[PDB]
Amino acid sequence: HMMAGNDSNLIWLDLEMTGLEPVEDVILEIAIIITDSELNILAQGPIFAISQTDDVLDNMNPWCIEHHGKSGLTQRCRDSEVSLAHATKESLAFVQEWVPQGKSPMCGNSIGQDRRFINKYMPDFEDHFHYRNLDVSTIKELAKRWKPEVLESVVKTGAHLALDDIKESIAELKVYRELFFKL
Amino acid sequence: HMMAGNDSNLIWLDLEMTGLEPVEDVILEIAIIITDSELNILAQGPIFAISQTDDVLDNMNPWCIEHHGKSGLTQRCRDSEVSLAHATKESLAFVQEWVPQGKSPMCGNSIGQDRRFINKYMPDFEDHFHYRNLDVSTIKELAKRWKPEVLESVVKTGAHLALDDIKESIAELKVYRELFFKL
Ligand SMILES: O=c1ccn([C@@H]2O[C@H](COP(=O)(O)O)[C@@H](O)[C@H]2O)c(=O)[nH]1
Ligand SMILES: O=c1ccn([C@@H]2O[C@H](COP(=O)(O)O)[C@@H](O)[C@H]2O)c(=O)[nH]1
Ligand SMILES: O=c1ccn([C@@H]2O[C@H](COP(=O)(O)O)[C@@H](O)[C@H]2O)c(=O)[nH]1
Ligand SMILES: O=c1ccn([C@@H]2O[C@H](COP(=O)(O)O)[C@@H](O)[C@H]2O)c(=O)[nH]1
Ligand SMILES: [Mn+2]
Ligand SMILES: [Mn+2]
């Protein structure tokens, strides 16, 4: 692929989890997408729901069992045989074809929260990325203050799973690329 | 002081630390600036060099021994009697005076990294912020790819002192506001 190894390609990711604090909580779902510098979806990596026992799946926060319930996720985690070290091996591998090492920031909405869980649980996948984040939610906060009509064009999406979400982030940033940035 | 309490005020911060890994490293300095939504500086918070022992100061990572050595920070931390507890309480009270709880993201360059330290070491202070980050380095990464010439106007400065580092973040964002956003 002529684009593969382009220095300016971006790794986008979302995670789902059992909650907000890494000390306690664990990664349930993970999805990746690669884009070029202009935000064209170049390639997908794997979408892993991770194997998590019923004790863990029963002891999430009340937000988590209610929303990961109604959106067959917790059921996907039970029925999954995917390990976290196998999601990591397949996650890294996918990414590494596409970008040189330490080039792309980690991209997503509130991607620092995700990077916390990546940093503890998946520390070798993290090592491929530039230390920076490209947090789409930074631009949202600027839009809210500087040009909030722009938010009318942003598609909200009720879902809470890792591909729905990441795809939603890419497309948010597309809207800002078109109506908020001057390029 | 008229703008004290406005929902859309931004809390800006920069920390210096003994190193890049919260697990082992600690906070040596914090500076906070409040701006309005438009980036007019409204207040400067109290700057603290956090008291540390000769044991901590002499065995931080070699980057730090040199640049904190150079900068007069290592020495400000020797003479300081400021506990992280006091710095936290004071910084919280300052920020409460200017922005309602839960409204402002945490603002600066690669601010997710400073959030890691605040989360571990100053949890009460973190609780003031919205969960989101307003990361100027996200916009720097976008400018690199989409309008790299804008970076000629960004002013860089060598100082690695919290106050100087945050004023520089604010000013970098002012440059993008003018050259890179379509307001
Ligand atoms: O009110 C909330 C919203 C989200 N989450 C956590 O944040 C993770 C990522 O959320 P998102 O990608 O659905 O925003 C979820 O899997 C869940 O663990 C919560 O604990 N409470
Ligand atoms: O109270 C909350 C609600 C959501 N999230 C996190 O915020 C992100 C959603 O991003 P945003 O698009 O709302 O900024 C997810 O990573 C989710 O885990 C929090 O940390 N705290
Ligand atoms: O090459 C570096 C760059 C940064 N830092 C750590 O990150 C902190 C914050 O960086 P900055 O605000 O000076 O950029 C420094 O106090 C230092 O602990 C290093 O250890 N080595
Ligand atoms: O090699 C480096 C240099 C800086 N930093 C972190 O990034 C910040 C500088 O951010 P930026 O302005 O380069 O994005 C510093 O405060 C530091 O904590 C790193 O992790 N690695
Ligand atoms: Mn998310
Ligand atoms: Mn810094």
Author numbering:
A (entry chain B), B (entry chain A): -1 to 181
According to the publication:
Among these, ORN belongs to the DEDD superfamily, comprising 3′-5′ exonucleases that require a divalent cation for activity. Our research group have focused on the mechanism of action of oligoribonuclease (CpsORN) from the psychrophilic gram-negative bacterium Colwellia psychrerythraea strain 34H, to understand how the enzyme hydrolyses small nucleic acids.
We also report the structure of two separate uridine-bound forms that mimic the product bound state of CpsORN. Furthermore, the structure of CpsORN bound to two separated uridines was determined to understand how the cleaved products interact with CpsORN. In this structure, two uridine mononucleotides are located in similar positions as the last two 3′-terminal nucleotides of the U-U complex structure. Both uridine molecules interact with the manganese ion. The O atom from the phosphate of U2 directly interacts with manganese, and the C3 atom of U1 is located near the manganese ion and the O atom of U2. Structural comparison between separated uridine-bound structure and unliganded-structure clearly shows a prominent difference in their flexible loop region. The His158 residue showed inward movement toward the active site to interact with the cleaved uridine phosphate, in the two-uridine complex structure. Thus, the His158 was suspected as an activator of the water molecule during the enzymatic reaction of CpsORN. In separated two-uridine-bound structure, manganese ion has a different interaction network compared with those of the U-U complex structure.
